[PDB]
Design a protein around this ligand. Structure first.
Ligand SMILES: Nc1ncnc2c1ncn2[C@@H]1O[C@H](COP(=O)(O)OP(=O)(O)NP(=O)(O)O)[C@@H](O)[C@H]1O
Ligand SMILES: Nc1ncnc2c1ncn2[C@@H]1O[C@H](COP(=O)(O)OP(=O)(O)NP(=O)(O)O)[C@@H](O)[C@H]1O
Ligand SMILES: [Mg+2]
Ligand SMILES: [Mg+2]
Ligand SMILES: [Mg+2]
Ligand SMILES: [Zn+2]
Lengths: 550, 230, 48
RNA sequence: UCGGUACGGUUUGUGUAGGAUAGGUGGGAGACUGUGAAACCUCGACGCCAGUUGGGGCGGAGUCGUUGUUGAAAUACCAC
């Protein structure tokens, strides 16, 4: 009747609570959307529902025979293959018991003959449970819909941000009855989300997403679950209905607490100054100050320090010269015949779907690559700063402070001697929260940590690669209003189309079709011009794939 | 689309759970309008088949026959096929039938193999399996009984397989047969449902049931008849 | 900041010892070799 | 007038290859002249391949059908 249900659930440290009194319940087919700020507990609720952790109070009770999947905020894999990335979970109770049916039928005669009736027929019983057991012709069904990489290559550095396309195929093949997909639209395309839109719509089974897109929240979701910092409140309706009734709620809450804060100060002097006023009653009126001042500090949350990018040396007049570069691999044809300068004091945007080669183009510039037939002039005044797409500089065992400081005391950032602990809290880690391991940090504080160890050089040429992931609108605005005030050459790879309309001066973009798949067009102007230049120069200016039989 | 099919719609009462004797009278009145038909059985179960401990399958015996064309394929070599080639199989195959089946000559209905063939049956059961022709260790198509396997196809042993939707399906008889050639077939069917009765189901066990034919409308069936099928 | 934790054995899960740790110094559950009387020999003990 | 339960008829679903798997399971040579070429046409469903024989107002003659065979399966037809 209920797929999932919760008692008075309180997952917490006793010093710092992260969930508190989370009492709610879900139906079958309950398409849910989860919204909230960073630091609320949105991923520590989807972690209880998949059994990957246990609460410190209250029972979390899945239904009887409904299985649950999960896609965490960083997706793990195995280091074996790509078609291995459709057998580990997903088709895992059929594939592991598929070769054994072909192994039990090797025609032994001295070993056993009539014991093939209670084990080989028992394996014949479990193949009817899945209603299909050829498993081969219906596994290119699962990779010609995600547009997966070719299935015969391992997930080494060979895979970029289509690592997520594989982890959206281990999960969406198990078909769980409770589907906990936590931010599926990281690193995807202008059409990879557009595939996932039509797939999560007609989907028998419950869905909990912690997404930020607007097609899921306005048309697929039916319940919206706000996560306040520790609290949890359900609501009913799509996201257009949610924000209207959210607006009138924070209206009458905005002057609920104004006259509350006015009351505490009006009887602050009543309890501090002039304690001559009443004898032997004062221990009954003083407690009503404390009982409203201890609940005035459970919503006093307005301490949000700004993201600030430090400034180092004077940037000259030449930054990146690309001398007719070609780049590729054996048989592969990425970047071909590209020449562009890089404008001093200008945000540069990169446009392209997954699999064109955006993040290798920065690896040339720092030095992690070498061009095949071409050259890149660095210019003796720039200073690189490379934040990577895969966030590979995070060592998930040692604490936060040891990742960015390397155990030192002062680190060299802005041609000064900054005390390296003060450089940590500049990106939002106040004091005793240096001492917690980085592998368990939030999606905001793993993106407010990758900016720490990569902007540690004060460089006047910073190469932002997916900066708009897993961070809310209070920091996203505090980023884009902090890399406008930066004196030179921020270069950004992004997929948020409503981010490059804010902060762009130049666009490098892919425009390849069936004559050559490795063109790169350069543009002088913002994103609100390239979307109009494209329709007046080219002609390119759907038909959904099912992922299963039905 | 035809008045003659809808003329029997008045021959079925709405809220009256019929008897198995009154059941087969309507099959004699509907299927006689056209050629020969086959009587169907639909049973809804009060189980939860999402789990694996409530999958239900059993065998059956038909003392009145089945009326099936029953084209029998044999998968054996040596003396295993010799004790069944005289039993009445129309097309007796061998190890050469590996290349005739998947090549495009699929004209057979049954499949009888021996346990000394499964290294070559398993490459043929890839296509015959999802078509329902899987090697059966239960009834006798694939076992050590190489003598009475072909006669069981004319003996009337058909398994029943519940789906996820809690729907049982099992044919019981032809159209030219009378009512008394159906009471013994139908009464053992609900018995074999009770022979695979789960110990973890809830509520009322058999909550809805109907019996019809190929070109016949629905008929109410009584769950509270377990003794007076004849 | 010094809560009172109880220490339970690994095999029989009985609760034999209560003690105090500091919670901002040691976030994870302690492990000690203490004496379980129901087992008769020293065993390992986590928290609850 | 707005919703829950119970029953009943109608309708609904489009990776690619084939005259859009008419969705799952179990059967099965059936439908009888209803041509589709009136209309909210194209069954009025999806309007993505632009079409799934039924509120059918030329008819009572000719009917996507069986035959064709690309594909885990195309094939009418009712019943759960
Ligand atoms: N280590 C590698 N060796 C060879 N080819 C690679 C390697 N990594 C990626 N490729 C190929 O290059 C393509 C794109 O490279 P990639 O590093 O993923 O940059 P990218 O396009 O920015 N990834 P993304 O940010 O998700 O779009 C892939 O589709 C592969 O075909
Ligand atoms: N094991 C942990 N111990 C202590 N604090 C934790 C732990 N796990 C998470 N937190 C913090 O508690 C809060 C819970 O947030 P979490 O569920 O981890 O992601 P989220 O921030 O709520 N959603 P998102 O911002 O998209 O990552 C965050 O402030 C985390 O940094
Ligand atoms: Mg998260
Ligand atoms: Mg990349
Ligand atoms: Mg210590
Ligand atoms: Zn013990």
């Amino acid at each position: 009747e209920f797929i999932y249900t919760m008692k008075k659930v309180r997952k917490a440290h006793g010093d710092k609570v992260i969930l508190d009194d989370v009492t709610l319940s879900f139906y079958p087919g309950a398409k849910i959307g989860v919204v909230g700020p960073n630091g609320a507990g949105k991923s520590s609720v989807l972690r209880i529902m998949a059994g990957l952790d246990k609460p410190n109070n209250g029972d979390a009770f899945l239904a009887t025979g409904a299985t649950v999947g999960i896609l965490q905020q960083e997706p793990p894999l195995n280091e074996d293959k790509t078609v291995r990335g459709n057998v580990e979970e997903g088709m895992g109770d059929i594939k592991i018991k598929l070769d054994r049916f072909n192994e039990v039928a090797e025609l032994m005669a001295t070993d056993y003959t009539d014991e093939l009736m209670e084990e080989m027929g028992r394996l014949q019983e479990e193949l009817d449970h899945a209603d299909a057991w050829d498993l081969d012709a219906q596994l290119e069904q699962a990779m010609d819909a995600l547009r997966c990489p070719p299935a015969d290559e391992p997930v080494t550095n060979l895979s970029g941000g289509e690592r997520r396309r594989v982890a959206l195929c281990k999960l969406l093949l198990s078909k769980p009855d409770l589907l906990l997909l936590d931010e599926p639209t990281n690193h995807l395309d202008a059409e990879s989300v557009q595939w996932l839109e039509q797939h999560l719509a007609s989907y028998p089974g419950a869905i909990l997403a912690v997404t930020h897109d607007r097609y899921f929240l306005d048309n697929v979701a039916e319940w919206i679950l706000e996560l306040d910092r520790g609290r949890a409140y359900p609501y009913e309706g799509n996201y257009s209905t949610y924000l209207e009734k959210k607006a009138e709620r924070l209206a009458v809450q905005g002057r609920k607490d104004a006259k509350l804060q006015k009351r505490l100060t009006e009887e602050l002097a009543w309890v501090r100054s002039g304690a001559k006023a009443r004898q032997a009653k004062s221990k009954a009126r003083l407690q009503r100050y404390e009982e409203m001042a201890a609940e005035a500090e459970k919503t006093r949350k307005l301490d949000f320090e700004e993201i600030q990018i430090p400034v180092g040396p004077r940037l000259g007049n030449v930054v990146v010269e690309v001398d007719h570069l070609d780049k590729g691999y054996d048989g592969r044809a990425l970047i071909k015949d590209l020449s562009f300068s890089l404008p001093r004091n200008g945000i540069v945007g990169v446009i392209g779907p997954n699999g064109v080669g955006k993040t290798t183009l920065f690896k040339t510039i720092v030095g992690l690559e070498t061009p095949d037939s071409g050259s890149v002039k660095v210019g003796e005044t720039v200073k690189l700063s490379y934040v990577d797409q895969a966030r590979a500089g995070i060592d998930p065992r040692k604490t936060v402070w040891e990742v960015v400081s390397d155990g030192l005391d002062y680190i060299q950032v802005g041609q000064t001697e900054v005390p390296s602990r003060a450089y940590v809290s500049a990106f939002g880690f106040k004091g005793p929260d240096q001492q917690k391991p980085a592998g368990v940090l939030s999606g905001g504080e793993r993106n407010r940590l990758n900016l720490a160890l990569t902007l540690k050089q004060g460089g006047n040429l910073i190469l932002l690669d997916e900066p708009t992931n897993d961070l809310d609108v209070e920091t996203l605005g505090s980023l884009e209003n902090a890399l406008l005030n930066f004196p030179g050459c921020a270069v950004v790879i992004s997929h948020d189309r409503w981010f490059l309309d804010r902060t762009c001066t130049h666009i490098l973009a892919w425009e390849g079709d069936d004559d050559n798949e490795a063109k790169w067009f350069w543009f002088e102007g913002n994103f609100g011009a390239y979307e109009e230049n494209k329709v007046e120069r080219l002609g390119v200016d759907v038909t959904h794939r099912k992922l299963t039989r039905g | 689309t035809s008045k003659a099919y809808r003329a029997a719609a008045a021959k079925v009462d709405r809220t009256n759970l019929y008897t198995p004797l009154q059941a087969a009278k309507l099959a004699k009145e509907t299927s006689s309008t056209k050629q020969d038909a086959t009587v169907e059985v639909a049973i809804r179960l009060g189980v939860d088949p999402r789990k694996a401990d409530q999958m239900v399958r059993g065998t059956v015996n038909l003392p009145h026959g089945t009326g099936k064309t029953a084209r029998v394929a044999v998968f054996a070599v040596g003396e295993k096929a010799d004790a069944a080639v005289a039993a009445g199989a129309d097309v007796v195959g061998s190890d050469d039938l590996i290349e005739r089946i998947q090549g495009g000559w699929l004209e057979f209905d049954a499949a009888i193999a021996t346990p000394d063939q499964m290294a070559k049956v398993g490459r043929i059961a890839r296509v015959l399996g999802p078509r329902g022709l899987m090697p059966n260790p239960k009834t006798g198509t694939v076992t050590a009984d190489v003598a009475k396997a072909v006669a069981d196809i004319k003996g009337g042993k058909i398994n029943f397989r519940v789906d996820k939707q809690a729907n049982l399906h099992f044919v019981i008889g032809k159209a030219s047969f009378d009512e008394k050639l159906l009471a013994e077939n139908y009464g053992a069917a609900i018995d074999e449902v009770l022979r695979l009765k789960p110990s973890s189901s809830k509520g009322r066990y058999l909550k809805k049931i109907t019996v019809s034919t190929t070109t016949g409308p629905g008929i109410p069936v009584d769950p509270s008849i377990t003794r007076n099928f004849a | 900041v010094r809560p009172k934790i109880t220490l339970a054995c690994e095999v029989c899960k009985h609760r034999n010892y209560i003690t105090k740790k500091n919670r901002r110094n040691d976030p994870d559950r302690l492990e000690l070799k203490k004496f379980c009387p129901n087992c008769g020999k020293h065993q390992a003990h986590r928290e609850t």
